[PDB]
Every structure is written in structure tokens, then in C-alpha cells.
Amino acid sequence: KRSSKMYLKTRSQMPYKVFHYQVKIHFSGTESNTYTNQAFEISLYGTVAESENIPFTLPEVSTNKTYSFLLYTEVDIGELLMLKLKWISDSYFSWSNWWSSPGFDIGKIRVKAGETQKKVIFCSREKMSYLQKGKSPVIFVKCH
Amino acid sequence: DFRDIESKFALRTPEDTAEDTCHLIPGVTESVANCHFNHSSKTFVVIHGWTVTGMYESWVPKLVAALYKREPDSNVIVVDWLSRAQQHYPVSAGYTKLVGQDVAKFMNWMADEFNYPLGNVHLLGYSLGAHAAGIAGSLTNKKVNRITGLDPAGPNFEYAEAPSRLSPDDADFVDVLHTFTRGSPGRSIGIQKPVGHVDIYPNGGTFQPGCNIGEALRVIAERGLGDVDQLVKCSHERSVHLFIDSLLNEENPSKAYRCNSKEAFEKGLCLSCRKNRCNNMGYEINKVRAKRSSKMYLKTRSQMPYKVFHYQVKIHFSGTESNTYTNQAFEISLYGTVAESENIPFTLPEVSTNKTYSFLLYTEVDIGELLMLKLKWISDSYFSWSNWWSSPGFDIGKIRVKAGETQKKVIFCSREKMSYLQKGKSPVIFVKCH
Amino acid sequence: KRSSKMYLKTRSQMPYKVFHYQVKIHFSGTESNTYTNQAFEISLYGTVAESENIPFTLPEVSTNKTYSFLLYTEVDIGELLMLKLKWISDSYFSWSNWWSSPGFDIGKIRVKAGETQKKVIFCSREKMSYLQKGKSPVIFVKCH
């Protein structure tokens, strides 16, 4: 009935044909000091191939609040089993490796497959999450 | 009362063993006429199991092709776990009840409209499918002849009861292939508690040979990323491969043996079957009822033919020197009238004197009868250091090997004086005697 | 004054000259079901090079008890910053990825450098340890 805009992404030149796996996060932690302009790095493994070090950005991070973003990969993955949620920093060295750095807690994750509508519910482990800056990622699995 | 099916029943044919062409919708009799269904012949029902992907596993086509090869002019039905099994694994455990109710309704509708004899249907069950069939049939009014499953699932089924898991009363006859049981009780994928009238525990269920370590690393290798995922699934598909191999090779079925425990079978004191024991395995299994759970054991080759023999042995060790030794490796070889093995080893600790021992041996080649034997005793001092000075030795008298498939108490027989078995020495020959 | 036995390890053939970094663990958890004949995999990173996937064995694992073992590496590392404490299993697939598998808690670690006597006190993070079977390792750092 009217103009219908559209959007997508693509690879560099040869095959194009990228996927879309937008994500939601139910951030819920204790410390309520809001932060902004922070870089989130995640990775995913599936049943055909796997990406390793794909980054993304999400400012205005808060608590007791849900966020979302768009992610793209350039390799077929089919289904997806586990996830990585590393949080990067510019203080790699052991200066910021002991003293209390800001951290949050992760509950569930609601990634949604693009080509096929799959509300797969990712699922933090019993207690082993406590996402923190300059720390190892937090694993997740299929659940529910 | 046929609108909550949500599980389409397919019907393949020998010319098409890959893609589902028909859809036998319950209640709607039109499908039966649409797709030929010989109401006189036997009809199997394959129930696959959980799949991370959204398609049938790679074994269904081979299974169905072999099924047609074995029993032509017989209908085959496949189910559509898909759309429900893709969900979380516990969700599939819950949905087993729904699928069982659905299958029971299907069979009841068939027995009402067409009164097809229930004594001519198999509920071939794999993975979760075995438990699905087991919970099924029980709701059926006229019971089911055979419910032969494959590798019944362990989780959420141990510490359960008949209504919630496969039970011997779920059908007239039942048999399972416990192809994997390694791990703690109640947490190993493969249920270890015996379920059917007769159960089969190839290799003891610890693992299977036709595979390797598998996953080299979490990221470098392919855990479930295809490739080495099948290798990781070393045994879970070995059940179906064994079943299809037995189905194809109807002439010479493998003879699994009945015993008391895996260790007892390894020792080899529980092979003779004068009574109704040591029944066949596979399609040609002999239908039998037991007063209780009846465990069984056997061995197998790597992947293709399987169908190995069993030639357990006894030794009447009797020597002079009385210094006991332990954890020693015995190597033997045998020659027959069809073929011969060369360098098959085995182990026997706690060796002593004036005492008789026994063990279990297996070979993977047909031999028929057996003429002579080798009894070499190996060492880790090959070089001429331990080639002269007196090394421990024993004396050998008679040998009482017993053929498995055919009960033959052939009495092997040492020569007049030419035995004196010794470490790091040539074997001792033996012959038929007495 | 008498016979004095000695011991060591070595590489395969060419350089030999391996190190020795024996370790102690102060296992302290809640669930008291003892386990035996389990395989522990650890890895370490330093200031010169790093090993990746060195395994070792430790049966008779219990709770509220301290254990120790001997580890060897075949590459110079100098100092050591962080540690890996993965616990391996023979149920890689997602069968044993959700339902509660046995797990323990890790406090401090008391590795001791061989060539130079250094009672470096490794140190679990605030709460992010909960070592569990078939799970990502637990990171550790220099501390105290």
C-alpha cells in the first residue's frame, strides 16, 4: 500500500549471503552504577561451523533492564549449542586483574534465528556466570 | 478425536527409502487406499529419536532398505518426531507420552477400521523412540508382538516404572541392545537396568571398538559440528548397525551368550547353553519367556561383518617351580580347516602352579575345526640378555578348549616331553588327542 | 652418609631439560559424594611462553581435603600469571550439558616453582569458580 523499506547485511565481495541472529539480554545484577559506551564480544558454536571472535557494541548498559542488538555472521552454522559472552577492556595487564572491577549477572538469553523463526532460550548455568570486565566469557547452553 | 495428532506417519517403499511420499492420516481412511498397504503381510514401525538437526538421522534409509531386503511385500511406517524433538531434550522426554498416546490411537484406529492383526507389527525403537514405543502399546487393547528397541535412553527413565518407561509387559516379546553404559548409575545415557525378557550387552556396554578418541579439542575438532560428531557417537549407532547387519546376514546369525555378569563372561565359565540359553540376536532371535531379567554378553568385529566366534579355554598348569607370578601376558594362536589366526593375544594374571585357569578368547574369522595350537609367552626383554640365564618356566599337560557355537569338548594334548613353556621362548605345539 | 636416590622427568629426545611445577589444591565444596579415578586437565600461561592442553590424573578426590600432584612442562615459561583447571568427561555431547553434574568449589592454589623456590599463591576470583564436570575451566591469577 506504500513504500516498504528493507535492510540486511552482507559479506565482503564473493558469496555475500550472510545470516542474522539478533539477540536479547535480560541483564539483572546487584551493583547499580550505570556504564555507557562499552564493547561486548560474543562467539557461538553450532552443528556445521562456528565463529570465534565476532564483536559488537552496546552503550547505555544498566541493571534490571533488558537490551537487544543485531549480530551477523558470514558462515553457515545451522543450529547453535553454546555461546560466549566475553567483555573486553583496555587494561589487559594484571593491573586490573585483581581489584574489584565492575560486573553483572546473567540469567537467560533469547536469541532468535533469522531465516527460521526459532525462539531458542539460552540459559545460564546454576551459578557460574558473574560476567565481569576483563574476565573469561560466560558459557551458555540450550535449555528449557 | 483425531485432530491432536501432530505427528505424521509416513510409508516408504523399496524404490524410495529417502523421502516420505505418503501420509497415513489417522481416521481419514483415504490414505490407506491412496498408498498400497498389504493388510495380510507384516508391518514394521520405525521410531527414531532426538536429533539436533531438523531431519532424519543418516541410518534410517539403510535400516529401511535392509528391512525390505529381508522381508519384501511388507509395509513400513515412519514417524515424524520432527517439530517436537528439536525442542530441549527434557521437553522430548515429556513429549514421549504424547507420541506414545498418538501411536496407540493410530494402532487402535487401525484395529477398529481394518482390524489388522496386532501380532504382525514391530515397534522398532531407538534412542528415545524405544521408550516412546514402550509407553505405547500398553494403551493398546490387543497388545503387540514385538517391541524390539535399540539403545534405550537412560536419563529421566531410571528410577521409574512401567507406565513411564519401557517394560516387559508393554508387549508380548521384547529385546534391547544395551550398546553403551559407561558412567555412573542413573547418569549414563544408556540405561543399564535390564528391561526386556532378554537383553543384550555387546562388549559389556563399556564402549565399542569401531572408533577412536574422537574430539581432539572443543574448538579445533567438531563436537557436534558434524565431522567427528559421528565418531563421538561411537556406540549409540552401533546398535542399529548391528541390527541391520544381522538382518542382512540371515544365514549365519551371531550367537550371543547368556551369563551371570560381565566379569563372569570375561572369565569364560558361562558359555555352555544346554537349556534355553545363548539365544540368537537380531531378527532371527528365538521368542522366549523368562522368570526374570536375563542378561547376556558377546563380542564383535570392528564394523562391517561382526559375527565373531567364541572359543574359551582352560589350562591345567602343573609345574615344579612354585614362585607365583602376576599380571603376565599370554599369546596364543590356532590353526583349523578353513582359515587360521596368527598373533591373537590375551591376558591372565595371578598365575600359579598345580592350579587350573580359564579365560575367554575371540576370533573374527571362520575356522571350523581346529587342529593345532600355539602358546607363546611374551616378555619385554627380547634381546639376548634374557635368552640364556634361567628364566621362569612351567609345564603344560592337557588343554580343554570348548567350541562355542557347537559344543565340542576337544581335548588338546601336549606332546610326550616337548613342552616346558618358558618366558621369551618359542611357543608349545599341541594337537588333537584322546 | 648413605645411598641418595633422585628423580626427574625429560622431553622426548633432543633438548631434554624439562621443568617441575608441582601443585596443591585446597578442595572445599558442599556436596560430599566422593569420586575416584578422575582426569584433571590444567593449563598455564607465563611471561615467555605457555602450554595449552597438558593433562594429569588425580584419583580419590574428596571434599574438605587438600591434594597435590606433580606436573611437568617442556617449554620455558619464566613467571606464571593465570591458570586453567578444566575437568574432562566422556560425555561431551549435550546429554550431560544441562542436568546437574557433580561439581566442587575452588579457593586458593599453592603451586611451587621448582628451579626457583616461589610459593606463589594462586587465588580464585570472588565467586566465579564452581568447578564442574564437562564445563569451562576456572581462571586464576596472582594474588595475596
Author numbering:
A (entry chain C), C (entry chain B): 326 to 469
B (entry chain A): 36 to 469
Task: Quote what the paper states about this structure.
Building off these in situ observations, we returned to cryo-EM and found conditions to enrich the 11-nm LPL filament on grids and solve a 4.2-Å resolution structure. The higher resolution cryo-EM structure reveals that the 11-nm-diameter LPL helix is assembled from inactive dimers of LPL that are very similar to those that are the basis for the 25-nm helix. As was seen in the 25-nm LPL filament, the base subunit of the 11-nm LPL helix is a dihedral dimer of LPL. The filament is made of repeating pairs of LPL molecules with occluded active sites, rendering the LPL inactive. Another difference between the structures is the resolution of the flexible lid of LPL, which was poorly resolved in the 25-nm-diameter structure. Thus, the LPL lid domain may be less mobile in the narrower interior of the thinner filament. The known heparan-binding residues of LPL are located on outside of the filament. The tomography was performed on human cell vesicles expressing human LPL, while the cryo-EM images are of bovine LPL, a 94% identical ortholog that is more readily purified. The subtomogram average and high-resolution cryo-EM structures both have similar outer diameters and hollow centers.
LPL is a secreted lipase that is active in the blood, where it is the primary enzyme that hydrolyzes triglycerides from circulating lipoproteins such as chylomicrons. Before secretion, LPL is stored in sphingomyelin-rich vesicles, and insulin signals the trafficking of these secretory vesicles out of cells and into circulation. Earlier studies reported that at high concentrations, LPL was present in a “cryptic” or inactive storage form in secretory vesicles. The storage of high concentrations of LPL in an ordered but inactive form presents many potential biological advantages, including preventing lipase activity before secretion, avoiding the aggregation of concentrated LPL, and quick postprandial delivery of lipase to the bloodstream.
